[PDB]
Coordinates of N, CA and C in Angstrom, one line a residue:
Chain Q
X2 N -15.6 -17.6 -22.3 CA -15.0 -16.4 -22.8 C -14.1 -16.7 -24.0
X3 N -14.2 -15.8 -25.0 CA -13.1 -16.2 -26.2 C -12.5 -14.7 -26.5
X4 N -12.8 -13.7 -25.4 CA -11.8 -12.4 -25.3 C -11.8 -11.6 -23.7
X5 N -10.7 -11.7 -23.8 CA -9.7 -10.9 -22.6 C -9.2 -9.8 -23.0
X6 N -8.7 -9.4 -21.6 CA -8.3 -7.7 -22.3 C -7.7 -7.5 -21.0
X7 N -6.6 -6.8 -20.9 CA -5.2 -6.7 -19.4 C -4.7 -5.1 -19.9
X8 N -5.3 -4.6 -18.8 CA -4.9 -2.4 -18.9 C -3.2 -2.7 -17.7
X9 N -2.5 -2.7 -18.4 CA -0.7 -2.4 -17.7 C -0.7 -1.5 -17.3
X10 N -0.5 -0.9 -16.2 CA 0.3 -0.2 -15.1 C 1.0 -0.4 -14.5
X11 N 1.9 0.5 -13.8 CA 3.1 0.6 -12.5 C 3.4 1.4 -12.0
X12 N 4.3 1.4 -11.4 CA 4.9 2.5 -10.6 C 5.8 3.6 -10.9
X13 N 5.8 3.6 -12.6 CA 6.3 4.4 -13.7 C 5.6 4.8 -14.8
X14 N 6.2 4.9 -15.9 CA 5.6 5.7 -17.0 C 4.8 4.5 -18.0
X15 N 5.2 3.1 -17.8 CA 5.2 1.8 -18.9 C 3.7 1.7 -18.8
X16 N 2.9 1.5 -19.5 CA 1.4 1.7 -19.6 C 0.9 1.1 -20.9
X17 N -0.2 0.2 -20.8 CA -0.9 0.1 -22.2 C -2.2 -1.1 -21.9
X18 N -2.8 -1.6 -23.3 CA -3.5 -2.9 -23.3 C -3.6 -3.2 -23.9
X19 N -3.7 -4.7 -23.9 CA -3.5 -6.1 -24.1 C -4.8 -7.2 -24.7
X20 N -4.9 -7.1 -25.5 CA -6.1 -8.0 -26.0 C -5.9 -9.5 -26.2
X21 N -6.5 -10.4 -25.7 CA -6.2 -12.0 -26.5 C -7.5 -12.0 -26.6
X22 N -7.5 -12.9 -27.9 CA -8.7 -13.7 -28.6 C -8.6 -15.2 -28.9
X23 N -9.2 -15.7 -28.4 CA -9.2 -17.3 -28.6 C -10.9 -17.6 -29.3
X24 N -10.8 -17.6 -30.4 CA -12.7 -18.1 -31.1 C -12.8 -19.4 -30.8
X25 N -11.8 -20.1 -30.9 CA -12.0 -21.7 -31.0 C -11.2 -22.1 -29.7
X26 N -12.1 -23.1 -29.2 CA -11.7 -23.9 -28.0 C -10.6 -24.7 -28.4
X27 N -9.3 -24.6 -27.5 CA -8.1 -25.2 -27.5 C -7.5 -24.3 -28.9
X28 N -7.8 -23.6 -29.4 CA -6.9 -23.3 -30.5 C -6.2 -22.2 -30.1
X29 N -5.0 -21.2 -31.2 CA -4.3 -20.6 -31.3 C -5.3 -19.5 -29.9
X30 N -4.3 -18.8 -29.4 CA -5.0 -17.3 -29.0 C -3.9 -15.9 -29.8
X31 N -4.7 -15.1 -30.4 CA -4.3 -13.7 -30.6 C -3.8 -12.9 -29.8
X32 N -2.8 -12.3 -29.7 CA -2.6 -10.9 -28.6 C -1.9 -9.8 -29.3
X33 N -2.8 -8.6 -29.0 CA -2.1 -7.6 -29.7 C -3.0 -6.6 -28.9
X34 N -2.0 -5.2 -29.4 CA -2.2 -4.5 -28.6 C -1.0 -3.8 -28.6
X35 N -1.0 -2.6 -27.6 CA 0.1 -1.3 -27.4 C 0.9 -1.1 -26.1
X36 N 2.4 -0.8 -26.2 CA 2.8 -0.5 -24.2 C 3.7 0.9 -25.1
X37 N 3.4 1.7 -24.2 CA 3.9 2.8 -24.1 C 4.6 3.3 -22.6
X38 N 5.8 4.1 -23.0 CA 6.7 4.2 -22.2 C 7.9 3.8 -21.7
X39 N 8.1 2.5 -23.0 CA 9.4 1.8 -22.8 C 10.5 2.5 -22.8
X40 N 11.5 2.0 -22.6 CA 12.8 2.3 -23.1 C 13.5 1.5 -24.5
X41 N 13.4 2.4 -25.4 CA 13.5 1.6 -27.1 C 14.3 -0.2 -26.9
X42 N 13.9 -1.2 -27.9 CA 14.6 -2.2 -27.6 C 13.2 -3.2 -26.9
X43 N 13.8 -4.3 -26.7 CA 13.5 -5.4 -26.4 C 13.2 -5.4 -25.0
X44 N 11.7 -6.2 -24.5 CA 11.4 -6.5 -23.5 C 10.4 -7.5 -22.8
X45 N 11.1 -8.3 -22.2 CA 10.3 -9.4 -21.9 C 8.8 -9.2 -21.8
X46 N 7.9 -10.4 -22.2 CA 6.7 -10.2 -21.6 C 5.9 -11.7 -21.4
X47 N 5.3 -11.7 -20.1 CA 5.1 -12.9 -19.7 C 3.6 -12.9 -18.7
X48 N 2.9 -13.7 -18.9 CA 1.7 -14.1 -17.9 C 2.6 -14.9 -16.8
X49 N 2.1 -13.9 -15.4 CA 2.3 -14.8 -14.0 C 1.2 -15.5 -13.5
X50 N 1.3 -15.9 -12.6 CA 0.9 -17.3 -12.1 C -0.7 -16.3 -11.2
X51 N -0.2 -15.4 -10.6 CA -1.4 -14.8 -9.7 C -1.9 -13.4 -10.1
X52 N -3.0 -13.2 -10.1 CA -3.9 -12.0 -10.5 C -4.0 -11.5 -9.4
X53 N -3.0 -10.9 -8.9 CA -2.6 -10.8 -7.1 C -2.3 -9.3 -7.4
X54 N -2.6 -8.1 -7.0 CA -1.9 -7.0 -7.3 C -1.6 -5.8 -5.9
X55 N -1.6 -7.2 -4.9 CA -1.8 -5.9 -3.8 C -0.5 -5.1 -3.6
X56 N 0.6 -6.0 -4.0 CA 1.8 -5.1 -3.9 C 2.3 -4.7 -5.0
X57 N 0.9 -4.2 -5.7 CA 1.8 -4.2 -7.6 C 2.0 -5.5 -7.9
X58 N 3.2 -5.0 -8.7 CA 3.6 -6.3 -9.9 C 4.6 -7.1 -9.3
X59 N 5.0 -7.0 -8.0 CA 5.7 -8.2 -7.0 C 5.0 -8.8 -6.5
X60 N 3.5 -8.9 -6.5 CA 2.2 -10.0 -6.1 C 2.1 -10.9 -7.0
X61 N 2.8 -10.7 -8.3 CA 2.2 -11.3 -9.6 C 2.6 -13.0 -9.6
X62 N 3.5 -13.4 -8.5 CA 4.2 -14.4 -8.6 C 5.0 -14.9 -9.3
X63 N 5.6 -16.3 -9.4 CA 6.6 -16.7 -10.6 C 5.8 -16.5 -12.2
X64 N 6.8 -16.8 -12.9 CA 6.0 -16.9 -14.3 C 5.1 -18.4 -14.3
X65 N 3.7 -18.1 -14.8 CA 2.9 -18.9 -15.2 C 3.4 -20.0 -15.7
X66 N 3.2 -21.1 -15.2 CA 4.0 -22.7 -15.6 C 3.6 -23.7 -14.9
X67 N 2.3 -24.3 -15.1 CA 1.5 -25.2 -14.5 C 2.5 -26.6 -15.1
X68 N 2.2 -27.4 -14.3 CA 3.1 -28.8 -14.4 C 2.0 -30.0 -14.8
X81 N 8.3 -21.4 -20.1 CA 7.3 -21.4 -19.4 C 6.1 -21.3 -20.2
X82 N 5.1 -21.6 -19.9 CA 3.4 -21.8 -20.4 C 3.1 -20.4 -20.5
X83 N 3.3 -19.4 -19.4 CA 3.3 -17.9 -19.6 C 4.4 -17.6 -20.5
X84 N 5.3 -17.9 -21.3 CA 6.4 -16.9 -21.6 C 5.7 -16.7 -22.8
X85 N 5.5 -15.1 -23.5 CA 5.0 -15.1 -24.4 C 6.5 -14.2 -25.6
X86 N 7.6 -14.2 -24.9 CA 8.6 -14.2 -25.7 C 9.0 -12.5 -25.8
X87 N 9.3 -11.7 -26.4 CA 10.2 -9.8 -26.3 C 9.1 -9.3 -26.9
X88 N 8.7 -8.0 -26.2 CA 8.1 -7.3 -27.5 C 9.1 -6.0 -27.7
X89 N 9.3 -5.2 -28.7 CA 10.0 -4.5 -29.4 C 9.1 -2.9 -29.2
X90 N 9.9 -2.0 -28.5 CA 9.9 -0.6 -28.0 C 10.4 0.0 -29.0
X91 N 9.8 0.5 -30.2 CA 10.7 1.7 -30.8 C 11.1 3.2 -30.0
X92 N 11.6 3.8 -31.2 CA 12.0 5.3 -30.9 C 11.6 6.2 -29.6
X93 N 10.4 6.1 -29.9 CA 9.4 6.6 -29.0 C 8.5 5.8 -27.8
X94 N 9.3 4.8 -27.3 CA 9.1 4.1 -26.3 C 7.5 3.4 -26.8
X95 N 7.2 3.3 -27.9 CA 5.9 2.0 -28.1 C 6.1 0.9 -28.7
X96 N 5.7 -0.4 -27.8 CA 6.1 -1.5 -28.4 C 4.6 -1.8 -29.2
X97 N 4.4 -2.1 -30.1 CA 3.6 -2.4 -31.0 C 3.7 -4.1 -31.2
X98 N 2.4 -4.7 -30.3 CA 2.2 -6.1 -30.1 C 1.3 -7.0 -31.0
X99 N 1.5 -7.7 -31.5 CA 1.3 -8.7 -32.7 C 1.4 -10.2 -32.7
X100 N 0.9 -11.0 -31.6 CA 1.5 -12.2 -31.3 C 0.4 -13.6 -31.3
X101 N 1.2 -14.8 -32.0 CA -0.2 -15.5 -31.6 C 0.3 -16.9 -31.0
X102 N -0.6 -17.5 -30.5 CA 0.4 -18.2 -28.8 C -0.3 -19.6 -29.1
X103 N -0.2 -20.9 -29.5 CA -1.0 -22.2 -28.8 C -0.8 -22.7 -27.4
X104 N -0.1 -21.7 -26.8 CA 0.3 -22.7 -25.3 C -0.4 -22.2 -24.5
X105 N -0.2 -20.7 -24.4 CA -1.9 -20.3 -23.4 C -3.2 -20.6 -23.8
X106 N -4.2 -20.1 -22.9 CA -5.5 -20.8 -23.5 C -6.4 -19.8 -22.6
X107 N -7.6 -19.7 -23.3 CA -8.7 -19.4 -22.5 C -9.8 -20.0 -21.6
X108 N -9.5 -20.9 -21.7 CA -9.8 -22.2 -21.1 C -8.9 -23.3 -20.3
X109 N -9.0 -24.1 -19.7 CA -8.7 -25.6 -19.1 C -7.1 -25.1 -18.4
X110 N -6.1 -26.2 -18.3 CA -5.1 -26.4 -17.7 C -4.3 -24.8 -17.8
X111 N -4.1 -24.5 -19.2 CA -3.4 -23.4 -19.5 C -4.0 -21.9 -19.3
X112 N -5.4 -21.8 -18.9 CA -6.2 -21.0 -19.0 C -5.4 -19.9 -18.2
X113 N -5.7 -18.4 -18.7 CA -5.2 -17.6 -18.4 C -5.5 -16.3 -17.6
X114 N -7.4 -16.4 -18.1 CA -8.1 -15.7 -16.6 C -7.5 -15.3 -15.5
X115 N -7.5 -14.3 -15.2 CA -7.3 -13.9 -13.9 C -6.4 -14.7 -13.3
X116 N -5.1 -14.3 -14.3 CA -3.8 -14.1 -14.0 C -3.0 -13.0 -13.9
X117 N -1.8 -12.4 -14.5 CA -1.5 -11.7 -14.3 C 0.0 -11.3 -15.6
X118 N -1.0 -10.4 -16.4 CA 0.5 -10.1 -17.7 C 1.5 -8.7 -17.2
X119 N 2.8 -9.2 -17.2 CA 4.0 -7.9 -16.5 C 4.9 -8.1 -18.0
X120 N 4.7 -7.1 -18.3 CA 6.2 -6.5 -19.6 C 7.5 -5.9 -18.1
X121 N 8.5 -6.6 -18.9 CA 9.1 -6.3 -17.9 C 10.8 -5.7 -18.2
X122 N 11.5 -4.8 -17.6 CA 12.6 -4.0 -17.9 C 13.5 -4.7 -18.8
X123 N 14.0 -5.8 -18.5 CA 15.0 -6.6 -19.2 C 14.2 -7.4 -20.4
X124 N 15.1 -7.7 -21.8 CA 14.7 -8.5 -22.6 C 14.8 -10.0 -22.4
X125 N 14.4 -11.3 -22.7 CA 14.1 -12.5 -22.4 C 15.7 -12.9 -23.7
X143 N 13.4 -5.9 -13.7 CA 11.9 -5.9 -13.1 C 11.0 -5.8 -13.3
X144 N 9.7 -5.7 -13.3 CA 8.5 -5.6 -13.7 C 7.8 -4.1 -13.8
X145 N 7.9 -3.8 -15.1 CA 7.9 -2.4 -15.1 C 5.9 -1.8 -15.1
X146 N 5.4 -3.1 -16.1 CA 4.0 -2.7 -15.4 C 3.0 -3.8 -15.7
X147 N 1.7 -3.7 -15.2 CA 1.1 -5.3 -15.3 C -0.2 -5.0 -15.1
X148 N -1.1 -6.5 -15.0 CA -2.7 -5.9 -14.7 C -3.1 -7.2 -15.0
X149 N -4.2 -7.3 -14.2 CA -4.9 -9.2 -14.4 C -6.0 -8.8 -15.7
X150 N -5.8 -10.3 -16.2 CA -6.5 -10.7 -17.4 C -7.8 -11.0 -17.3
X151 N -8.9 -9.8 -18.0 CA -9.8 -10.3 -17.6 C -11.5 -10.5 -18.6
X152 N -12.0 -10.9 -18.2 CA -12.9 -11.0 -19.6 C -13.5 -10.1 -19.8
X153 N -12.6 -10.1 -21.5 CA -13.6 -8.6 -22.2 C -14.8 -9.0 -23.2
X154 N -15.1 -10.3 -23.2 CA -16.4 -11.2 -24.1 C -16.3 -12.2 -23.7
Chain Y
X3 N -10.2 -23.1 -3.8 CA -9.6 -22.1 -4.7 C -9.9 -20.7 -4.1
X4 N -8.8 -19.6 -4.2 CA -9.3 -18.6 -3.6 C -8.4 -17.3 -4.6
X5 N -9.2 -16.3 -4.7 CA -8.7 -15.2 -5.5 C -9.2 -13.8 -4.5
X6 N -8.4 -12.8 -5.2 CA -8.5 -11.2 -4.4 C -8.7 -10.5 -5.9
X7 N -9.2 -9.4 -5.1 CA -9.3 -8.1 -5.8 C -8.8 -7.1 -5.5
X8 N -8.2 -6.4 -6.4 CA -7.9 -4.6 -5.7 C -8.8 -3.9 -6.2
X9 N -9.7 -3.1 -5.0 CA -10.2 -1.9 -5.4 C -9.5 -0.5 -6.2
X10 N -9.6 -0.2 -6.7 CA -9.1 1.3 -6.8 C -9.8 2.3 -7.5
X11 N -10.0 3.8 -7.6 CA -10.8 4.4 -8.0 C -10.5 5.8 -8.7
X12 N -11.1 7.0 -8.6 CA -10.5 7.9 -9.0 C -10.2 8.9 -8.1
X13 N -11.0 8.6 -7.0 CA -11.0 9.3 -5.5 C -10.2 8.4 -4.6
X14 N -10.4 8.4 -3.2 CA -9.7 8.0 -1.7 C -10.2 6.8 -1.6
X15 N -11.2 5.9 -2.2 CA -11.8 4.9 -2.4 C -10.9 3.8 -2.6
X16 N -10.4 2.8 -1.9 CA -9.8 1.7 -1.8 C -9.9 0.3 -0.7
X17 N -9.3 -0.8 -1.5 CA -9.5 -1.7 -0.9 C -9.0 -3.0 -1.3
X18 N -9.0 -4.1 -0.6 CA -8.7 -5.8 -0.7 C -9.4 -6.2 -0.1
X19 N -9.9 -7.4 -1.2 CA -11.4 -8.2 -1.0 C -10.8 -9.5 -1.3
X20 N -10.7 -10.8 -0.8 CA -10.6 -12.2 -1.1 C -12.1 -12.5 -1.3
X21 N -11.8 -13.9 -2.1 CA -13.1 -14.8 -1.6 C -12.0 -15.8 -1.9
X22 N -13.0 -17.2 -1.4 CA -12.8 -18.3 -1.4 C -13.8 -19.5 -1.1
X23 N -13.6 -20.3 -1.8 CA -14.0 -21.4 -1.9 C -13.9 -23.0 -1.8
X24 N -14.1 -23.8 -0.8 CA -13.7 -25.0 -0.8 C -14.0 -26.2 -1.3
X25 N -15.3 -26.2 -1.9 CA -15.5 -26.8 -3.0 C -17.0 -26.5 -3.6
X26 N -16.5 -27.1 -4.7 CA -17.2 -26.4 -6.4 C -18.7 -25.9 -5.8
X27 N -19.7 -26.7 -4.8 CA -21.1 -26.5 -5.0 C -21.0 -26.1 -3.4
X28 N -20.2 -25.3 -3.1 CA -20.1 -24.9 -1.9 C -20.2 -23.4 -1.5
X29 N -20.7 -22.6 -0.6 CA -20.3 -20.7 -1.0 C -19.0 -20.5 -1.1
X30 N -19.1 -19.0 -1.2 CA -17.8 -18.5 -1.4 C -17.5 -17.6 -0.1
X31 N -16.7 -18.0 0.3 CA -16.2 -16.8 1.6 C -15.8 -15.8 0.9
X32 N -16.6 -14.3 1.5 CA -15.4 -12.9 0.8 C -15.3 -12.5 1.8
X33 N -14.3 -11.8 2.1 CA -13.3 -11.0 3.1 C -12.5 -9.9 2.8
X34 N -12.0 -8.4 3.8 CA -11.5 -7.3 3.3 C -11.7 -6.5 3.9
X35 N -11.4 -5.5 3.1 CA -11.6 -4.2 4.2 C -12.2 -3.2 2.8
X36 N -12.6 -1.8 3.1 CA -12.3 -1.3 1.8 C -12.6 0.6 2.5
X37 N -12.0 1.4 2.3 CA -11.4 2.8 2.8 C -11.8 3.4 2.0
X38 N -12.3 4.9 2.7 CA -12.7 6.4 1.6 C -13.7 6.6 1.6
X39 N -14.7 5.4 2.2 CA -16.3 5.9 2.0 C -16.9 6.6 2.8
X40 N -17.8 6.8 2.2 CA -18.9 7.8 2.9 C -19.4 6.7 4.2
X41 N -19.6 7.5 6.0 CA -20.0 6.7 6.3 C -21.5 6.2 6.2
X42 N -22.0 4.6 6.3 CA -23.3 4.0 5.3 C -23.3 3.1 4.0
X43 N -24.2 3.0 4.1 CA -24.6 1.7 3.4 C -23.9 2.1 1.5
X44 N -23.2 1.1 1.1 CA -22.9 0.6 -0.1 C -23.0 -0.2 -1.0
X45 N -23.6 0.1 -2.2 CA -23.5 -1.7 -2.9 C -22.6 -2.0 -3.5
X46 N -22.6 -3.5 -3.8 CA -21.5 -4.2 -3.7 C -21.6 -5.0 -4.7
X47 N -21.2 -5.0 -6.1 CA -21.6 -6.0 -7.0 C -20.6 -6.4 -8.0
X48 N -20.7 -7.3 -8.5 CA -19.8 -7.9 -9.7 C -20.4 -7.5 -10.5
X49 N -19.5 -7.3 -12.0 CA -20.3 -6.9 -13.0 C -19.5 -7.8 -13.9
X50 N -20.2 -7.9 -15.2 CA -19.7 -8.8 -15.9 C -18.7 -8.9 -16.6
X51 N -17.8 -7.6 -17.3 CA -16.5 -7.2 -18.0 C -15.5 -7.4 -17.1
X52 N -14.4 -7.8 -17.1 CA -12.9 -7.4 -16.3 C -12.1 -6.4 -17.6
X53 N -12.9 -5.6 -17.8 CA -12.2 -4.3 -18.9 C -12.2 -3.2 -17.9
X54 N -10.6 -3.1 -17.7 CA -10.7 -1.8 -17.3 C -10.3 -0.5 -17.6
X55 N -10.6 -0.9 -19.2 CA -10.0 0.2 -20.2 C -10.9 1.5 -19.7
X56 N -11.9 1.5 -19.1 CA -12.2 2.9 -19.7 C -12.1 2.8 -17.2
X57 N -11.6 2.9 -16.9 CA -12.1 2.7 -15.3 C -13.1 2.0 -14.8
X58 N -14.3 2.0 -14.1 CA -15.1 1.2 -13.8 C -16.2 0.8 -14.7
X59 N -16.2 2.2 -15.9 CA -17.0 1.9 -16.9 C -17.4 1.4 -17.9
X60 N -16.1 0.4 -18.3 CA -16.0 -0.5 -18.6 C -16.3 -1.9 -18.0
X61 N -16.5 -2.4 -17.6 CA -17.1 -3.2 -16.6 C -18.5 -4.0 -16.9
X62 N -19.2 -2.9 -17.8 CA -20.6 -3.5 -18.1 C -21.1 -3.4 -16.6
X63 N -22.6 -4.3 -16.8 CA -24.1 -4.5 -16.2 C -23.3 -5.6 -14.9
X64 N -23.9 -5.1 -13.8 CA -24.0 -6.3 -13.2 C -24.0 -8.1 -13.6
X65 N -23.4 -8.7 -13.2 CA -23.2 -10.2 -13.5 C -24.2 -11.0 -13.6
X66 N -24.8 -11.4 -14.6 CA -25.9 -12.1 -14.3 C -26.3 -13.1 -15.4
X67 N -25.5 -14.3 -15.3 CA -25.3 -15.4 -16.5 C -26.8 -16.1 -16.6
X81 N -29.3 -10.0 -9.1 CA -28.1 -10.7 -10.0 C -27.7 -11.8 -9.3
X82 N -27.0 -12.2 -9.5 CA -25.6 -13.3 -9.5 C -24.7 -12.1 -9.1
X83 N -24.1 -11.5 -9.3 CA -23.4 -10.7 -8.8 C -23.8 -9.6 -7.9
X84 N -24.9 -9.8 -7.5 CA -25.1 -8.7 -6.5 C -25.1 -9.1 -4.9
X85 N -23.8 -8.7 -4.5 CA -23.1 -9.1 -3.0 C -24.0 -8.6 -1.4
X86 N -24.8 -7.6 -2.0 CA -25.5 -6.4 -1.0 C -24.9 -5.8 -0.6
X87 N -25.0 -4.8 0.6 CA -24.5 -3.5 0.5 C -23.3 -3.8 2.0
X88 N -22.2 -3.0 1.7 CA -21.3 -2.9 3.2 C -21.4 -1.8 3.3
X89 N -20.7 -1.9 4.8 CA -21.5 -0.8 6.2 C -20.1 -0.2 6.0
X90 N -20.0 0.9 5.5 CA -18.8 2.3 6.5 C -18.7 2.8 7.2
X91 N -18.2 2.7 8.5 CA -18.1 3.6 9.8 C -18.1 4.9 9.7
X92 N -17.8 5.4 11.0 CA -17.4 7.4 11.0 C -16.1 7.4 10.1
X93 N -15.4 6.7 10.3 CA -13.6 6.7 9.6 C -13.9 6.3 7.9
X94 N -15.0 6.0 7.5 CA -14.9 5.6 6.5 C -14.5 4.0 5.8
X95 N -14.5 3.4 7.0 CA -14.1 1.7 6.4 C -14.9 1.0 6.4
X96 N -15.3 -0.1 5.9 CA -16.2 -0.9 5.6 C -15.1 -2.3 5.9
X97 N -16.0 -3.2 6.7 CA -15.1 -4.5 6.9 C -16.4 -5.1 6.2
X98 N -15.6 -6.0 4.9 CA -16.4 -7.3 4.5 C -16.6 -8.4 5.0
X99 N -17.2 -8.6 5.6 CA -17.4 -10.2 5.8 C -18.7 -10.8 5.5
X100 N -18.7 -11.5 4.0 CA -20.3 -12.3 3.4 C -19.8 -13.5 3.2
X101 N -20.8 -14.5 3.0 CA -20.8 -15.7 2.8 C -21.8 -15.6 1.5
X102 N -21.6 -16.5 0.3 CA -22.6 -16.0 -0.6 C -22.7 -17.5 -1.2
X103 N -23.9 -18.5 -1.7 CA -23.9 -19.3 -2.1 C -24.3 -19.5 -4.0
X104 N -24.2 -18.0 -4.4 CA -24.7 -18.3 -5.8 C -23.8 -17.8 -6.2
X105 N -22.6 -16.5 -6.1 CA -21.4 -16.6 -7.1 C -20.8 -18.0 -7.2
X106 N -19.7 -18.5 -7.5 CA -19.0 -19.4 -7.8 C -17.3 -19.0 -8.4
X107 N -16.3 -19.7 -8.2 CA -15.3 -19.6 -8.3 C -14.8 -21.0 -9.3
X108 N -15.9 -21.3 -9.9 CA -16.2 -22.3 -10.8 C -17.3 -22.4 -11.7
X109 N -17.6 -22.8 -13.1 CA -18.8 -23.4 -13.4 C -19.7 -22.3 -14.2
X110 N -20.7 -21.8 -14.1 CA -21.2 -21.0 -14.9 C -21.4 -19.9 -14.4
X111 N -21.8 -19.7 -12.9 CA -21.5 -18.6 -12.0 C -20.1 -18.4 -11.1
X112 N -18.7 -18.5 -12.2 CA -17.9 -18.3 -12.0 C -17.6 -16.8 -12.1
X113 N -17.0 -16.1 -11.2 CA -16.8 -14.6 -11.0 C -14.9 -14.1 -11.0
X114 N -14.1 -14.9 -11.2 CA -12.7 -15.2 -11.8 C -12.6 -13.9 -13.1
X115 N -11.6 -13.0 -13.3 CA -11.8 -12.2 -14.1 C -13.0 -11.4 -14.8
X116 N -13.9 -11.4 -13.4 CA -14.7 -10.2 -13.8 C -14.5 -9.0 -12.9
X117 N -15.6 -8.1 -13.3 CA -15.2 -7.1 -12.1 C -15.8 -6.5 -10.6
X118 N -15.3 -6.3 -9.6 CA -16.0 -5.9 -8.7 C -16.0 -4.6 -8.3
X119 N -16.9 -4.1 -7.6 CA -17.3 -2.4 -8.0 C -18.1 -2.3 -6.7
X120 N -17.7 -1.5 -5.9 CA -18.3 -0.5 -4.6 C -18.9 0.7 -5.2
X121 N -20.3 0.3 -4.5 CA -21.0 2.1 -5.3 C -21.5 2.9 -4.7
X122 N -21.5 4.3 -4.9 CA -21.8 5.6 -3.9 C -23.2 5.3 -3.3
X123 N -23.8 4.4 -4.1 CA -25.3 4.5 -3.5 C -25.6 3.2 -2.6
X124 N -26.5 3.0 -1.6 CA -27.0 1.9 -1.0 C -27.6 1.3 -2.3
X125 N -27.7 -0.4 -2.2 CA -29.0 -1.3 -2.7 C -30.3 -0.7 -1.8
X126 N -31.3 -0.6 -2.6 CA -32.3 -1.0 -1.3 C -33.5 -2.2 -1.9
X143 N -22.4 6.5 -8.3 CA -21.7 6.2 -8.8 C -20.6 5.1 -8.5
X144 N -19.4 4.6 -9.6 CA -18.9 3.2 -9.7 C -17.9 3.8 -9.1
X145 N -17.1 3.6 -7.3 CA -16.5 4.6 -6.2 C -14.9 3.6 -6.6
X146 N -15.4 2.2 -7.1 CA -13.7 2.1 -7.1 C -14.1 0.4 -7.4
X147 N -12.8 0.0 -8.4 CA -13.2 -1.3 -8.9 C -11.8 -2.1 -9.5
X148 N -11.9 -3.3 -9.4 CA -10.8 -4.5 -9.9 C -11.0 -5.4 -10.5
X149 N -10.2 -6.0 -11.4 CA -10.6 -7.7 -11.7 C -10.6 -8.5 -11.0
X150 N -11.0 -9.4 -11.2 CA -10.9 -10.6 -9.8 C -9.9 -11.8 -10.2
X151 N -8.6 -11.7 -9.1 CA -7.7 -12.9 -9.7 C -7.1 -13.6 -9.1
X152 N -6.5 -14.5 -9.6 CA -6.1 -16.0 -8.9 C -5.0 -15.4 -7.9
X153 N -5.7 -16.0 -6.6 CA -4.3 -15.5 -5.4 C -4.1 -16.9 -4.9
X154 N -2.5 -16.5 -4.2 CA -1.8 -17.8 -3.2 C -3.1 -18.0 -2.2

């Protein structure tokens, strides 16, 4: 697979998706994409550890950190609650140790609860 | 290695499905329950997208690098279906690995897409 795609939901208004692109094995991955519903400002966003969603986004487990490897650092909510995402990552991966599959990405209330989430899954 | 799914749909259609696996060239246990259906036979398949941008329709074709075709579970008068297959050609590894794709219960027996998940890494 060298594209994924993660649809965010919750148990509120925070909603969107999430594209990563990896063309090249072990290289950079792409993520971009849209969350609507924020509250303007800064907000953590992170791959967890499990693509677990039976209780929501409290299944998701800790952040992703194989022995963070998930932390993918704030994304930025304007005016109108849309954070408009633009990010490019060498520590995840679509592949091997760091691989990201059918995990689990949560944007979450504070800037770096889990307002909304969804497992990663292959879109190519 | 073992992962779940959540069903969910746009009707009363729901459910939790594990599988698991103990090693690479070994089957996969699936397990679960899944609610809403009609009582009778349903199919049961992976399909190859974990996009759930558009609902199950997104999802694409059945899995088939089918390979993803689980066969059909039984619904009672109540509408529940208890999973229990053993299946030796998906994988939870390797090239018939089924890890972020999607799985999908359908209105019709094997002989519409009622409610579907990605498939992801559980405890």
């Amino acid at each position: 697979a060298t594209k994924v795609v993660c649809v965010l939901k919750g148990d509120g208004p925070v909603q969107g998706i999430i594209n990563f692109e990896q063309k090249e094995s072990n290289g950079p991955v792409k993520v971009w994409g849209s969350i609507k519903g924020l509250t303007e400002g800064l907000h953590g966003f992170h791959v967890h550890e499990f693509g677990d969603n039976t209780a929501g986004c409290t299944s998701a487990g800790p952040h992703f950190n194989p022995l963070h490897v998930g932390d993918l650092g704030n994304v930025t909510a304007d005016k109108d609650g849309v954070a408009d995402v633009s990010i490019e990552d060498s520590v995840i991966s679509l592949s091997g140790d760091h691989c990201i599959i059918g995990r689990t990405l949560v944007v979450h209330e504070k800037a770096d609860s889990r307002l909304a989430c969804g497992v990663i899954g292959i879109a190519q």
